[PDB]
Amino acid sequence: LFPPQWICCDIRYLDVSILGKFAVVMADPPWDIGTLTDDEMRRLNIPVLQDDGFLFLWVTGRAMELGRECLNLWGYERVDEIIWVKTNQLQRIIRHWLNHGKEHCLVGVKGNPQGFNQGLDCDVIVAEVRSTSHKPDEIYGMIERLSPGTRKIELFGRPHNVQPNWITLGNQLDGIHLLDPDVVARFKQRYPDGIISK
Amino acid sequence: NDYCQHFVDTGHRPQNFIRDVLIRLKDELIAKSNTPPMYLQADIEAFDIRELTPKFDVILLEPPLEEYYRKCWTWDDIMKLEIDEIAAPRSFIFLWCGSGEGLDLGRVCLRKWGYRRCEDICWIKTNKNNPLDPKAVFQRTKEHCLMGIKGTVDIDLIITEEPEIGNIEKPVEIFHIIEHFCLGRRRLHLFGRDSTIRPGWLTVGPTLTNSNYNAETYASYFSAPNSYLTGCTEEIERL
Ligand SMILES: Nc1ncnc2c1ncn2[C@@H]1O[C@H](C(=O)NC2CCNCC2)[C@@H](O)[C@H]1O
C-alpha cells in the first residue's frame, strides 16, 4: 500500500517471509571492510523476497567482490552496475592508489521480470553528497520509472530512506509502521507480542 | 536536483554536467626514464607469450571484446591467456572489461592470474554532441578498467565524449594514470595498436604493421644499475 512503511528490527533475526514478494530489493549493507560478518551477509534470507525482479546492492572496497558473491549465492545474475559520481553543490567531483570519486551499486536480476521499463535511465548518477553514509535520492526515481507502482523493499534503511511503495527495514528506524493489510495480518500472527528476537 | 530525470527528459547524460573535468616535472622525469618504444606484431592466440621477456612490472590488457562493435576475443579466450607466466612476482595489471559480463569475468581472470583488485577505474562517456544488451536494465554509458596487484593526485574516473561509432580506442588518459603510479619501467600493452605505441611501453598485438622487438635489446634497458627504477626518478649517471 502506497504510503511509506517500515520495521525497526535486526535484519539478521527478522522472519522476512511475512513481507511477501517484491519487484525490487535494495540494500546499502554494513559490509565488514556496527557491521555484519561475511557469513551473516551470506546467510540473509534474500531468496524469499522475490520471484521475478531486480536487486540493487551498494558495494565498496572488497565488497565489490563479496557483494558479487552474495548476489550469486542469493540466486541473482549481475546485469548492470550503477556508478554514482559524487559532486558538490557546484557540480565538481569530490576528489589507496587513487582518490575515489564514485560509489558502485550492483544490479542483479532474478527470474524473468516482465513489464519493467528497462533502458529509460542510464547507469551514471551525478548527485551531491548530502550527509556521510547517504546514497542519492535519485535512485528511487530511477527505480520508480523502471517499475512503477510495484512493491519494493529496502534493507538497512534509515529514516530518510522511507518512500512510498517501499517497506524499509533497519535498526535505526522509529518503531514499526505497517499499513498493507496482508503484511499487518502476517506480522500479528508471526509476532503477536510485537517482539522480534532470536 | 536530478540529472537522471533530466536525462530521461532530454537525452543528455548526467555526466555531461560535471564541471572542470604543479602537476608536471614528475611527468618530465617519467619521460626521461622512459625506454624507447618497442612493439611486435603477434597473433596472441597462436603466440607463446613466454617469448616476451623479461617479466613485466605493468601489464595493460585490452582484448577486443564483441560489445565494442555495434577477430573478437571472448572472455573464454581471454581467461585462457597465460598472463601469470610473464608477470613479475610484484607487478600490476590494468584490464579493460567493458560494461557487461566482463565486469565479473574480468575479476575471475585477475584472480586466476594471481592478482587482487585494488582499484576500479570507470571511463565515463559524455554525449554532449549527440544528446542495448538484452539483459541490460539501463543504458550503459561507461567502461571499466580493473587494476590488479600481485605480490607485496589521480582519481578513479576518466570522463570524455563517447567516441564515434566503430572507434574502439580507449582514452589515452589511462596511460597517464598508470605512469603516475611509478610502478616500474617494464610495461606491456597487450592488444595495443599502431595508434597506441608509446615511449616507455612494449606494445604487442595482431594488427601492428611493423615490429622492432628484440628480447635481448629489450632486457638491456633494465640491466644494472637500472633494474629497480620506478620510472619516476632520474637516470643513473654513467661514464
Ligand atoms: N543487523 C542490523 N539490522 C538492521 N540494521 C542494521 C543492522 N546492522 C547495522 N544496521 C544499520 O544499517 C545502517 C548502516 O549501517 N548503513 C551504512 C552501510 C555502509 N555504508 C554507509 C551506511 C545503519 O542504520 C545501521 O544501524
Q: CA–CA separation, B140 vs A31, rounded Å?
A: 27
CA of B181 to nearest chain A CA: how many angstroms apart?
Answer: 8
Lining ligand 1 with CB less than 6 A are A 10-12, 28-30, 34, 133, 156, 158, 170-172
Q: CA–CA separation, B36 vs A140, rounded Å?
A: 52
Q: CA–CA separation, B92 vs B63, rounded Å?
A: 17
Other Cβ atoms less than 10 A from the Cβ of B126: the count is 21
Please compute Rg for chain B using Cα positions.
Answer: 19
Closest CB to B136 among A80, A102, A141? A80
Where is A140: in which H helix or E strand? Answer: helix A138-146
Backbone φ, ψ for residue A81 (5° rounding): -145, 110
* A8 closest CA partner among A156, A159, A176, A165: A176
Q: CA–CA separation, A100 vs B72, rounded Å?
A: 32
Q: How far is the CA of B105 from the centre of ligand 1 (A)?
A: 30
Domain ranges (residues) in chain B: 3-220
Chain B interface, Cβ < 8 Å to A: 2-5, 7-8, 13-15, 17-20, 99, 103-104, 107, 117-122, 124, 132, 135-142, 144, 147, 153-157, 177, 181
- Which DSSP string corresponds to chain B? --HHHHHHHH---GGGG-------SHHHHHHHHPPPPEEEE--TTTS-GGGS-S-EEEEEE----GGG------HHHHHTS-GGGTEEEEEEEEEEEESSTHHHHHHHHHHHTT-EEEEEEEEEEE-TT----TT-SSB--EEEEEEEEE----BSEEEEEPPPTT--PPPTHHHHHHHHT---S-EEEET--GGG--TT-EEEETT-S-----HHHHHHTT-TTSTT--SSSPPPP--
Listing from the earlier edge strand, what are the strands of the sheet with A5-8? A124-128, A77-87, A102-110, A53-59, A24-27, A152-155, A166-170, A5-8, A176-177
Residue A25 and residue A150 in contact, taking contact as beta carbons nearer than 8 Å: no
For B3-220, the fitting CATH number among 3.30.420, 3.30.70, 3.40.50, 1.10.3470 is 3.40.50
Contact B153 A116 (CB under 8 A): no
| Range list of H helices, A31-109 | 38-43, 63-73
Cell of A142: 530511477
In one letter, which amino acid is B231?
A: G
What's the gap between Cα B189 and its chain centre? Answer: 7
Q: CA–CA separation, A167 vs A180, rounded Å?
A: 10
Give A159's DSSP letter: G
Instruction: Specify whether the backbone of B20 is left (phi greater than 0), alpha (psi in -120 to 50) or beta.
Output: left
Instruction: Specify whether the backbone of A85 is left (phi greater than 0), alpha (psi in -120 to 50) or beta.
Output: beta
How many A-B residue pairs are in contact by the CB < 8 A criterion? Answer: 128
Residue A7 marked as a ligand binder? no
Beta strand extents in A51-151 (DSSP E only): 53-59, 77-87, 102-110, 124-128
Residue A158 marked as a ligand binder? yes
Q: CA–CA separation, B159 vs B149, rounded Å?
A: 24
Q: CA–CA separation, B195 vs B211, rounded Å?
A: 13
Contact B155 A93 (CB under 8 A): yes
Q: CA–CA separation, B65 vs B117, rounded Å?
A: 21
List the determination method.
X-ray
Where is A7: in which H helix or E strand? Answer: strand A5-8
Mutate to test the interface with B, among A104, A114, A124, A129 (most CBs of B within 10 A): A124
Q: Whose CA is nearest to atom 20 of ligand 1?
A: A133
CA of A24 to nearest chain B CA: how many angstroms apart?
Answer: 12
Give A51's DSSP letter: S
**Bridge partners (DSSP) listed for residue B91:** B150
Other Cβ atoms less than 10 A from the Cβ of B230: the count is 14
Q: How far apart are the first and last CA of chain A?
A: 29
Which is it for strands B187-190 and B142-150: parallel, antiparallel or unpaired?
unpaired
